[PDB]
Design a protein around this ligand. Sequence first.
Ligand SMILES: [Cl-]
Ligand SMILES: [Cl-]
Ligand SMILES: [Cl-]
Ligand SMILES: [Mg+2]
Ligand SMILES: [Mg+2]
Ligand SMILES: [Mg+2]
Ligand SMILES: [Mg+2]
Ligand SMILES: [Mg+2]
Lengths: 388, 381, 381, 386, 381
Amino acid sequence: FQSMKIVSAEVFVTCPGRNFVTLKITTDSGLTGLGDATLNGRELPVASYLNDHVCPQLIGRDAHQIEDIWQYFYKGAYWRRGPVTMSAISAVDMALWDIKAKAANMPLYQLLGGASRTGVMVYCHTTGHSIDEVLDDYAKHRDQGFKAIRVQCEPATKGSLPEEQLWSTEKYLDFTPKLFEAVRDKFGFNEHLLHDMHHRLTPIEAARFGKSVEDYRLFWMEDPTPAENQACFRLIRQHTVTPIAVGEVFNSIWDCKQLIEEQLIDYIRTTITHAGGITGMRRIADFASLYQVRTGSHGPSDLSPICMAAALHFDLWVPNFGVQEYMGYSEQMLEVFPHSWTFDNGYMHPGEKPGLGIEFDEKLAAKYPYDPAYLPVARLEDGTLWNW
Amino acid sequence: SMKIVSAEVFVTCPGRNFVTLKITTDSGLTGLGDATLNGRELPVASYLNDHVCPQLIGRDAHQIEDIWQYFYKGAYWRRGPVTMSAISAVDMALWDIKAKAANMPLYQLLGGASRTGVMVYCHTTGHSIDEVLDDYAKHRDQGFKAIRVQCGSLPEEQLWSTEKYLDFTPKLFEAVRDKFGFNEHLLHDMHHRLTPIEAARFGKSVEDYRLFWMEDPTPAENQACFRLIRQHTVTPIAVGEVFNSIWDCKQLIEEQLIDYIRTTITHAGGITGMRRIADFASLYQVRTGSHGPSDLSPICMAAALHFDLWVPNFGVQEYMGYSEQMLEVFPHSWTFDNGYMHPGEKPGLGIEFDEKLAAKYPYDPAYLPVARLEDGTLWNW
Amino acid sequence: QSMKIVSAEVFVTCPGRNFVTLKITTDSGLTGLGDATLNGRELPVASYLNDHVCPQLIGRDAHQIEDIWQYFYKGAYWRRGPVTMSAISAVDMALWDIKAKAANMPLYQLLGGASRTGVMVYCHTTGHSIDEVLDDYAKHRDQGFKAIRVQCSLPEEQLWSTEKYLDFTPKLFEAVRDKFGFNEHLLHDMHHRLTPIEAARFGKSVEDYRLFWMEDPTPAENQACFRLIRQHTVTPIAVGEVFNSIWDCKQLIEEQLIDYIRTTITHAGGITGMRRIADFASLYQVRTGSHGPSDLSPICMAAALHFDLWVPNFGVQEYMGYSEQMLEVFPHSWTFDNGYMHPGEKPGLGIEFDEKLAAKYPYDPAYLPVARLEDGTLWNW
Amino acid sequence: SMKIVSAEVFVTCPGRNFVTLKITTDSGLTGLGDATLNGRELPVASYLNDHVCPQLIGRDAHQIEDIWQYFYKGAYWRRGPVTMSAISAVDMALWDIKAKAANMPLYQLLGGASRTGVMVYCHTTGHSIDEVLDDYAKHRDQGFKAIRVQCEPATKGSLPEEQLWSTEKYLDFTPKLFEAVRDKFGFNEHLLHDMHHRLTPIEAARFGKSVEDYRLFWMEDPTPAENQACFRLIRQHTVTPIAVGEVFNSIWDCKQLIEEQLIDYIRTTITHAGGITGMRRIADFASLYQVRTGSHGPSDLSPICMAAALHFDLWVPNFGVQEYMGYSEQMLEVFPHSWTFDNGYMHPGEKPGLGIEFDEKLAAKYPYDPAYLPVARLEDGTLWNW
Amino acid sequence: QSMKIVSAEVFVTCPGRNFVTLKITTDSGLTGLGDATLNGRELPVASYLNDHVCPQLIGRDAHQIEDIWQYFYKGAYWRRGPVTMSAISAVDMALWDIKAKAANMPLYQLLGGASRTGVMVYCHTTGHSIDEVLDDYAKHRDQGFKAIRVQCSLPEEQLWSTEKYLDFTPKLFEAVRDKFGFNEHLLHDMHHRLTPIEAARFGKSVEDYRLFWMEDPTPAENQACFRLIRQHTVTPIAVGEVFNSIWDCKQLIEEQLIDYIRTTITHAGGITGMRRIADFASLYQVRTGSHGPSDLSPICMAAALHFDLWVPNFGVQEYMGYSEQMLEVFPHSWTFDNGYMHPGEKPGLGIEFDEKLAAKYPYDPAYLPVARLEDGTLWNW
Ligand SMILES: [Cl-]
Ligand SMILES: [Cl-]
Ligand SMILES: [Cl-]
Ligand SMILES: [Mg+2]
Ligand SMILES: [Mg+2]
Ligand SMILES: [Mg+2]
Ligand SMILES: [Mg+2]
Ligand SMILES: [Mg+2]
């Protein structure tokens, strides 16, 4: 309210179905803020970054100074950005905005400039090992009122060893376009059809693929090629009108500045938890808007419901909103995070609970100890370690 | 939630012309915004009164973003000085309301303080070197850490000569540094008078005196015109007081042709727009240098100080200042001490408007001067 | 030899919709008219003229068109924008009216004389179904139109959906070309609704039907946004009704991203500004296709037809048409024969303004619609 | 095919914190790797201990490249300081092992010696011109051919020290310093200077112009480089050479700086920028543009990194210089070394592998002790770059 | 610890065609071989080694591979080129042979170890008609080949016609994909015959058949000549068999104009040079596809397979094959199983050179063909 100094900043590691890492900031006034810090397959280094280094440095600080605190840790780290660093910084930022919206006694989205929309369009996944199988999952999710659907013919598998998947580009190219003809043939052009390419193709391959699918008018093709070299998207963009989305693996505006300003992409999928929190995400979204690039935040189960809360708040205000991904959470996971958001015929809403409108049931959570789970790696026929 | 019950515009001339917007919610909350456009005040009065204000009535005062977008895109004819002065008034006033509603000084809503105080600069007047040196001492004595050094119904017409300016103006700075050393930041306004290669020369000619910035070197409708300056001098460059949009300066920033962006709350889209401008500028290590003359109302000054306190890439804040007469009309809460200002801690912007004191000053026309060269050529003032 | 301006007055009338007219009178009794209409923001321009520009016009030599344009363009300090430029254009238009009268010539003669024998215009087509559009198309063809554009209180809010537009609209053109063949020019307005890669797709999807142009594909404040469209389709692009300046379109043109520039006399700086725009466009083989809706007054249409008859790189002229009522307030002298118009041979613009009929209809507030997406996102209308 | 049986992480603080990785093959071959990330050590210990090390067990230690790729790409979340510090530890450790297997000092495996020694530079300091001049004198006497002039930064404690910064004062004073140094000692030694990320580009442009007469070997870290285009303004206004990259973890951090020829020295390191595998690719790329290596070498990189760097330095064609801030003897006891120093030049030695040891028993006498780099703030409290 | 070179000898033999081999021997008796073969210009390389490089190798520490490479690369003063680089590559190859032996490892181990389990190779197809090609294709498939390349005294002169090639060749691929489906990788060599817009057309004309690559579309001395191809087709491009340096392909790669770089150990600077080429290529997602004809000696193929097994960005390896006769002179240790090869686990390159069998076949002059167009214009073969 007046000057809320931080009395404690605590890290919680729990596995209610999968691993989540959580930060809790408490002020002297007793206000609490929650932040997700989950980094899938590499959760603990982030727990450490916070527990051992950042949290002790939060104590005594005026929680009102979100920006100074962000700068302090972003630059003060000396070694800048990266996934572990930014997961930490984001967790803090998220928690501080929670607190601030509470101090203000409003739902966060009000603080960002209010609602730009009445609801947040979300999209879901279809899983099947044949055309017929997918066609059904689609039918199913349609009926549940989803207006956007991701077609593909828990990723982080328990077991301290990453599972190794064989991959062939040639086959994927020849078949996948068939997958979409089918979905359009059967269901018409009524829902938004999304597709994730999982970083598997070289640029000229991703170019051919995009062309190969223009007839089916995808809402987007995602993560066409590894994007560490942002110029690699140029070849795709000059050869196809299939929209491009990328960015779930990005942790900073520096990862995507060139992709945006060269207009190489249509949707930016950076997330509150990995790309610098509310503070970072606002800057990314606003930058994107200059180039008519829209938001399409990554939303799998490996970002905690805390992140989902913050994302929905962000999504209701942000002018250049595109879509919000909504893989699900098991009931088991949701129980650990009492929420207050709503889902209604394809659209979500963060609700009107002050702050993020989210909770963390520590006692429940403290009953699921951390349990090692890792994302798969991909190799080619010949063993070449590839992009998963 | 709060519906807008009334949106009223006030024109007053407490020593100079000011146009003010007052928004009132069904809950009692009021928000103030500046709409002052020097020399073209009344077209903004009309833009609000006759057009925007009526369409504000009944709306949720919480939907700042939707409202900005509604009037920015909804106008169909986009941006411009009159349009953006109107949109910014509204925006400034809704953030006053939002932060009152949240019971916080605005800067708290922007992300909190990044600094303890806001460095400001003032103007030193003179008709000779010795006069300027005097006003300079006078201002350093008042605690200023930054000092800017310069030697009716019808606009005054002023005669301009570039060649004389080029030949003389550098001796002025030499004088100032000779007497006062290099302790204060030395700023200078070029008032759009030079072509790019002239500005290049000027910049080079003042490199020894390490200026904080040279401002408004050449008109910037063609943003590429700053390329020649930038490739020839390491004298820092500031620009933007006349801009009303990110679109006015995106190329200047992204090509790194400027060091300070001088856009303001009242003319460049309010808190909402200025945030986006400043954040974009930061990617390129461009800092804020907001324009702050007497022809932007204390209401703008209130918001600017709130903004300046949070904004990470803050550079400096201009403070021309106000007469006591002007201020009386705008009861204010900001503080000043030893060359630094602070917005204060009052909820909202921390500013008020004396509607009946204002009522005593009807609008009195005044116009910026135009410049002409020797041969009469209409030039840049 | 010297035509001092004795008066410059602003009239606002609503003979079926709103119009703002400027009247300049010299000491010799010569009068010139200028349109100042800005749809849905009419009164701020009224003010810009009435309160600020007009009194500064008094005493001036109406012969100095260029000096006046520059005086108000730069003298304003806050440069360009829709309200500013509507005012400056009103003046410029009326000053050329006066100059052509003083020369005892129709204005096109002052511009360099006729480059064509008549000005090809185009019209719109009403229809809520492929079937109803095909009817209006047939009708307009019978009226001799050689070029046809196909489309299927408080601001009305309209629900927009890009995906539907993408899927349906190509069928409308297949229809029209199936029934009517490739005899007329098929124009189409996209109304700023698509993102750039969306517009790229659209343009590609309509290549078979060989459109005269697709217009306003995407908001163009970021002029580079047109690059993605232009590299993906050979469907010609037209833009610019919402522009007030060469600065709004210089990149679009110099990067050869557009085929037609649609800026108008009333909004883009008058005859003086339009000339510079057209000439610049021509270097890059961009042709004119000026915006001509009902919300630009018959004074503009007269100004436009003179401009159109002369300008070498002429492409086409829009003609939404006027109601018998509106036309009344503006006695006119142009002609229309078999798809082609002509300004006539009367001195000046060849246009009148019936002030007493005008004073019969008072200003009546009317505002353009806004667009929203399904989720309520404020969009481009 | 010598499989990995253990991959152990140690955290010791013999004067300051180090993190060390030890890999052991089934044949008993061991490899050491540095993983120290100053002020953020423990997330790297965890990245290894908790995630990477268990996934190394049973793999063939010969497959340096598959392993590099496996963790680089396999992480899904690519690069960054913690990630690359972990990956680098394992890489230089695998190269240690490979050179041992080859029964050769590592430089031989990289392509052999390109020079007879490795020119290093030391730090000079003082709070007055006169004092710096003194320290300079000393270092020339010790035989340093290159000297860094300015006028243990990570301070033990809970909270980062906060330092007041003024750019204006720095611009006006600092050239006088170099003048004095040149006036007194002539132009016989290479004169270096670190700018510590403090300046904006146009400011750095001016500074660089302002010191041209003193012909600096380089001016380092002029302005934050997250936006690499920020170096264009500097490079077009001054002929003072530019070094940067101690804070980089990847080729992606510097590829634009190098290919637009905005820098003369790349300062990436074995521990932070991807190990031997990563640094080779970085050095080779830079050579195309006539950019040379200027490896960062403070005390906060372990003597294991120094051993690897000297091996790398002896081979790499485009070698520029090697920083050698130095190690207290307490530090060195824990890492029994075999490199040599002789008149401003160093040499990795001829011991197989890296030629470096880690005395686990001694390391165990010194437990992790929190210490953090300072932050900078301006007069008004603005959080700046330190 | 120190391996002085005691001897470095050059052998020229024609066991079915010409080969030039270099043998380096150390004071410890370790020997390393290197290929120096340059097809049709074999003897100038023999000389470069024999007369100039080899005596300068004597007395030197064979451990200093990098210093030696640099000494001859820059020391030559006249830098790179086919003859120069064949010589430098011969040396480099043989020096790494020696180093891996001294390390008692197969060389791939020195490079960073295996990145794959085997090296995918591809083969050619003989046929004077669509029908005969389809047969050889079937054959090679049965041999387990996973990737197949389809083609239909004094230098022999060959008549070339681009227009015919353009019209026919797409049918060859339709055939192959009609009969055999999309199971194998279809490669194709264009042999430098087309201009860039011709190659653009060709690539487009074959998109349906999804080639693994089209190779050598146009002479590439002007690397920008590849831009027109790359903007017009998504058919992957391979190039580089004729390159001797990174300088020959740096632009092709950095502008992302190619998908495979085909430089070889023997011609492009040895292991040392190829490593730098591959690593550079990888930044841009360019993969290796090294040229492997009979005119590169089994020493090269052994060098290549080691390189291929390690290099992360491996794409494919050509294997024209060797005659039982040639293979004789070069006892080898690599394997080939089911479309994939492997260098083996022998220390060094794993290759021998039967000197006494070699001295049985003397040099026999053989020269590549030249191409001429109809009118006799000397063209690219
Ligand atoms: Cl990281
Ligand atoms: Cl305006
Ligand atoms: Cl040669
Ligand atoms: Mg994905
Ligand atoms: Mg100024
Ligand atoms: Mg239109
Ligand atoms: Mg440094
Ligand atoms: Mg070939």
